[PDB]
Design a binder for this molecule. Structure first.
Ligand code: HEM
Ligand code: HEM
Lengths: 362, 361
């Protein structure tokens, strides 16, 4: 229930321990006034300082002038901060505005097309994003709702996604959660404590070529539908061969414990862990921070389940791209389909009560 | 951390309200009474396992390699999480298996109400399973696996996820707030009032349908809220809509949330004034609904609202008169009913040998 500090060299919500619920929104900008947009970034930062501390935005949710709408919509009243983090990111399409083209980072690479892609252009892309994570979904919704409200006229919501439960871990000392295919997910991820691994694989550095990004990261979001009907009729052995780990313990094939190191040659050549593993990808390493979703039925008598996949990396070209290319022959492909996609530059942290989101860019 | 599954009544009605909801409505595809009864027995066995935190069948792993696991596995290593599973039968069930003359009179079709805009695909259903739990993944896993067991005999018609309070951070003697920002649930039938439940909630034998004694009747309504319109309304307009203030939830003129309302001090079309049993000939409901937020629609708006669930001893004398009295509710400006269904919720599974629906079949 405690708060997660908002200030830092880095934005919270990345190396932070992974909170139970997610509300992810992508925004398009509807003002051509750079001054208006900068004032928005400052106002949103002020709201976030309140929101992540458990306080109502502006002058509160009630007790103001009767004839004016309340500053805060009020549904988080009486709730604790619940580890709320707010993480902001800039889409490639934002740099065509306010004269930012010269500032687009080289590591904000558009993704190539991948075999199997069935991307819905409505649930893809976006000028900027806010990732709201909390252990209470009312807290996460309230923050997105109130950010959008404050941005009325300057931004609209392009698309959003709710994650009802995490499928990722930055704390290997705690239990690994399972995804909706029933497998532990997050065993071999980067930990929030591994400060040297985060420096090499996650945080952008001055020398990488884009000084305003020093301290930030790069985010890939993929909405991935799961063919649970097809999966749920596969034998237990078939499911375990697809991944290279047993279902119960989550141990690499042949071994006894979830955290024993995989021996890649014992796995099938198209096994998911074998293909995604850094050793198979020239050392490429990712920080996975995704969440499960279900969005009703598919209209055909079945539940609609999937995974909202989020990966943070130091450079999209040396993180997500090579690992995803190596998955062209993944046995998991038979059961999944990518149906939404977006990349964002996540700027450095808000340094103190005078700093603001995107201040190094603007 | 668990709720007993066996009882005179099904759990999940008067038992403590859990944090999360997965509601699913199923359509029946088989015509065979025997095949259906068989399924009901299978379902009860799996429910016993799930509500105690165990995997269904022979488990999620450790079986024949060339067999699909009995349990899909995503709840492994989680606790029972106060999971309750409540099953109900829709009016359309009674057109099959020759049960037409066993439909309870109290399971009345709903009239059309002013402002209804019901989506057909998210309405109705031959039967429903309400899964509540403090962990959403426990709830989802239950529905997922019940649907799997029933494949070939039932399909999922529509499904709804919902959330109330988060109990690991909020006190249970603290009223939750709906997404309009008002405390919700202040004047409600509580699970402790065993005589109000008998008078208002539970079906009794002399009511007319003996197989439903110990049961209840469920109305579900998917109510969209026009969030962005509501949020532009003044604080005074919002409080005028309900007849309570937003901060404390006190009825107008009163000081504490739990002070009894003085209905003449509220606006004639205030929501509380129109819904109160005194304005409805004593009609009283047990509300057990959950908030929802499914995402954003095509115009950038929050697809969010209240998935309203009401239990009552007779639909004709509970939900119907009260909803009728809301014809002029000032709240109507800000909400839209977009989905609807009714169900007869049978009595409870009495012991290890009993099963869902046994009194009917
Ligand atoms: C629904 C889609 C996916 C599912 C269900 C899934 C599932 C899993 C599972 C069960 C594991 C083993 C446990 C672990 O170490 O975390 C794993 C590992 C991993 N996955 Fe995936 N995954 C999916 C998509 C992806 C994608 C799209 C990528 C990258 C583009 C990816 C990259 C990785 C990596 C790097 C590992 C760690 C392998 C290692 O270093 O040992 N996964 N995944
Ligand atoms: C979006 C839809 C709705 C919202 C946001 C809402 C909200 C509220 C609120 C804030 C209260 C006051 C506190 C309390 O719960 O006692 C209330 C009371 C109540 N509402 Fe609603 N409600 C909705 C729909 C309905 C419907 C459809 C019905 C019945 C058909 C209903 C029946 C009642 C009743 C019986 C009370 C208790 C009044 C009393 O006896 O004091 N509500 N509602």
């Amino acid at each position: 229930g405690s708060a997660v500090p908002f200030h830092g060299a880095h934005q919270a919500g990345i190396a932070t321990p992974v909170q139970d619920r997610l509300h992810f929104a992508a925004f398009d900008v509807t003002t051509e006034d750079r001054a208006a947009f900068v004032a928005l970034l400052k106002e949103w930062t002020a709201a976030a300082r309140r929101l992540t501390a458990g306080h109502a935005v502006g002058e509160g949710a009630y007790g103001g002038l009767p004839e004016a709408p309340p500053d805060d919509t009020g549904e988080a009243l009486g709730l604790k901060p619940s580890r709320l983090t707010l993480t902001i990111g800039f889409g490639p399409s934002l740099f065509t505005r306010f004269g930012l083209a010269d500032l687009r980072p080289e590591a904000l690479a558009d993704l190539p097309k991948f075999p199997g892609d069935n991307l819905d252009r409505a649930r893809s892309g976006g000028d900027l994003c806010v990732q709201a994570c909390a252990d209470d979904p009312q807290v996460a919704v309230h923050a997105i709702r109130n950010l959008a409200r404050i941005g009325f006229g300057k931004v609209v919501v392009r698309w959003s996604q709710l994650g009802f439960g995490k499928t990722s871990s930055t704390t290997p000392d705690k239990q690994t959660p399972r995804n909706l295919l029933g497998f532990k997910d997050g065993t071999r991820n980067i930990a929030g404590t591994e400060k040297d691994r985060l420096d090499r694989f996650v945080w952008a550095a001055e020398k990488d070529g884009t000084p305003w990004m020093t301290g930030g990261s790069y985010l890939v979001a993929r909405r991935i539908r799961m063919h649970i009907e097809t999966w749920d009729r596969a034998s237990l052995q078939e499911q375990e061969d697809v991944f290279g780990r047993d279902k119960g313990e989550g141990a690499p094939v042949g071994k006894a414990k979830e955290r024993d190191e995989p021996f890649l040659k014992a796995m099938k050549p198209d096994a998911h862990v074998r293909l995604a593993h850094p050793d198979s990808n020239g050392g490429a390493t990712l920080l996975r921070r995704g969440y499960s979703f279900t969005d009703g039925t598919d209209g055909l008598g079945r539940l609609d389940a999937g995974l909202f996949f989020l990966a943070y990396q130091r450079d999209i070209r040396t993180g997500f791209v090579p690992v995803q290319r190596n998955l062209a022959t993944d046995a998991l492909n038979e059961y999944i389909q990518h149906v939404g996609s977006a990349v964002f530059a996540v700027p450095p942290g808000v340094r103190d009560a005078d700093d603001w989101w995107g201040s190094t860019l603007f």
